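Replying to the earlier thread about multi-chain prediction with a worked example.

Input:
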Amino acid sequence: KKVVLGKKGDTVELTCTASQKKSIQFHWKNSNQIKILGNQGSFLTKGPSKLNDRADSRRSLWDQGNFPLIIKNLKIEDSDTYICEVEDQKEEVQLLVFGLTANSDTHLLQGQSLTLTLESPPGSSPSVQCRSPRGKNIQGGKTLSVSQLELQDSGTWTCTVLQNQKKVEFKIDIVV
Amino acid sequence: PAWRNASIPLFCATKNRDTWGTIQCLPDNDDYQEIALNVTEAFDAWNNTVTEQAVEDVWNLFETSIKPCVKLTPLCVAMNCTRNMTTSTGTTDTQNITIINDTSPCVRADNCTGLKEEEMVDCQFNMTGLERDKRKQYTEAWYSKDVICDNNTSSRSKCYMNHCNTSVITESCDKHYWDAMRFRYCAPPGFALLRCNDTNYSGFAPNCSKVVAATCTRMMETQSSTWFGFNGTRAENRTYIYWHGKNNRTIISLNNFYNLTMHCKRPGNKTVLPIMSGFKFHSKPVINKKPRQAWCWFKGEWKEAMQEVKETLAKHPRYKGNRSRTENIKFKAPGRGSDPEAAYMWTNCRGEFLYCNMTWFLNWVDNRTGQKQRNYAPCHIRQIINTWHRVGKNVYLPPREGELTCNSTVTSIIANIDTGDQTDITFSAEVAELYRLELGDYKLVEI
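Result:
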């Protein structure tokens, strides 16, 4: 199965695979067998879950043979596996949502220490590999603290997480 | 003799002489002959070619009889939509019972308290119309329960319709409707039709001890309805339920003893006399303020029929619920955000489709205390009408002015049966389950 990464608030696409070209009835089930989205003929019946106002789909490819799952406002606790139910087959899709943020907004003077707060879901092992415009590729565990922060070390740092050969970019706002 | 299965569609014999009935069907001469056979055969109400042929002919009749003005195919098209909020404030909820009949003064003036005015949406979109290479602009009204918008804070934003049936195919549409039509499926020579005639038929029957052979089928009704069934032909003097062998899709029939009749009426323009006013003998006409709402009136012993339905469900052999307790079983509508067919009614009244609030009827039937118990359902006509058989969508003309009355008899109920801690029987929008109830005991065999 394929796994994607969310940017903690944006939308993610979980496409399905079908070659029948019939627009058959499809079901969206999580790991706890709770209904979220489904088909009733040519309808959508929103099941009793916690993604009633967040789960959507790009339904142009109903006749093409792909059923995406669009979830907006992703959170830490929303990371779960989903299965697509077409032609009595189960296609498991894995979704992982993580993020990274700090605690100091603008009071970052010269020579002050840097604090970070990595927000990660349980059951995962992230690896922080931040990239700096000055060439500082600091690698470590989950929580990273830098004792040096000056005027020349400002800007949007490119901090990424390597996990199962997947990595995405983020932005950190530093004001000195 | 020995007979094998077949999938060849039959020819239809109708009694009405409309355009579609004369083009696609033969005349019917009531040559219904039945021969009883002492054989055992397997009958399936869902996996039958006769059921699919009947549903296809009913869908063909629906498409040919009332032509849509707009035919829509699945394709998501980006468009800009504005939100015209029709805000009407409600008063305090009164819990007193009002058994409102047809002689009430509020229904005749058509100024009686019904459903809310839903927020209509205007959208503009550029696509190829009849010409395949030239983009054309259209502006049509859509409701608030069939739209999904990316930005709900702004009045104008990029939005999509539900199910993405957003490809307009134009058609010159005239307000035509079909009357009470009946037909039967007569078999060609060299072929026979077998009917399972046992009283314990529940949709599935691997062993049918009462098989009756015939050359033609029985009387039929083509009135489309969700959550109910009107003017049915197989309404016996009993209540019987059918259960599919793989899922929760069911169809429940009713009894003719309680006389469950159906009356749906929408007043239009009320005028005391054609307009002849002056100094003397001048009188006002009752103008319409909400022409988009209608009324449907439930008559007959509904609670005793509901109790017989509960008894038939408790006496079903495959029912896993509590037999000794019948108060646990309740009728519940699906929650909000579901289909319009899964939120209101969908029945035809001379070309007009009415969407009626089940909640007051649910409170009246299930005797839920503390809620508004009304023996009817307040309706609101939807200009945006969903489809049930094929993946499509249609937009109709604005409704006419005047009274469009309908009289029917309620014979069956479309519902989904779920068994658990609390037996929740929700209702489905499968219109094909009515015809699968009607001819599910019939099965074509090849001589």
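Residues 128 and 161 of chain A are 5 Å apart (CA to CA).

Feel free to reuse this layout for your own posts.
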